[PDB]
Symmetry: D3
Subunit: 62 residues, 6 copies
């Protein structure tokens, strides 16, 4: 049985409602595309400071 | 800038078409709920092997 | 050689002693079941706020 | 609610029986040391390939 | 196409310049050794408190 | 103590020699920029499968 575990890393400062909706809608997405039982779908959100991530070697804070 | 990175761990056995849809729909969910620019949303699917995970100390899903 | 790396995500607010014991006992568990050298077993704990995770699309804070 | 999620990265090559025991014993360790409800404790084992990891810049364990 | 995603867990308290340089130099390392396009290389830094990690069952704080 | 743990997710298809170099060079980068003792720097390479990841909702790199 599928037990999806979703980790979402994104920029800090999201509203509680944005977080709430992200968890629900990401769960919907996983459920409908894979057929996983909804009760087996887990979501964790990790917020990041802009000085802790980047692309092409340049941090978002810079 | 937002740069969401989504990791999805799930049991091996979905088709490439299902995983294509999973990428699209997780991206839709992140874009809708956080306002992140679509071009900055990344999704990685990691496939778990049978017998390599569990809940409640047993090799089953929830 | 096995080099186990363990990541434990759990609800924030654990006592320092609970954390201490978790690291030791999880290490014991990995060592005894896999035969890994104890010196090669690494544990990281990531504490989560209840508004940053959920199951079945519902956050623990809700 | 607690919802521990434990990820264990370790070298490929353990038997399914050893990995079954690993799931059980990591679950026991988490339950004992944190008080988390057993039904909410999840363990995922990710197998590392030979030559795909290292310590001290060399492809060896500690 | 390669889309490298790098996660660096390390002890908290790094200077902003150390972080900046880590992101740039790790990106250089990935680029030169794999041939990945620099624009596809992503780095996330997760800082850890010494009471949240250990090796051989002993936390750095202890 | 520092104990950096670096995870690198990248598309399957590099040679073992390239991955050896990746481990060495990521280690060099971490050592240079943070001052971490080399013996405490760990690198794990996780290979993503084709069609198992994307950016902008499509199965392509940036
Ligand atoms: Zn449903
Ligand atoms: Zn994390
Ligand atoms: Zn797959
Ligand atoms: Zn669960
Ligand atoms: Zn021992
Ligand atoms: Zn993984
Ligand atoms: Zn295995
Ligand atoms: Zn080590
Ligand atoms: Zn370049
Ligand atoms: Zn490989
Ligand atoms: Zn990108």
């Amino acid at each position: 049985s599928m037990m999806p575990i979703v980790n979402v890393k994104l920029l800090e400062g999201r509203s509680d409602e944005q977080l709430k909706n992200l968890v629900s809608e990401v769960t919907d997405a996983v459920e409908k595309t894979t057929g996983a039982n909804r009760q087996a779908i887990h979501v964790v959100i990790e917020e990041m400071k802009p000085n802790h991530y980047g692309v092409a070697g340049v941090r978002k804070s810079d």
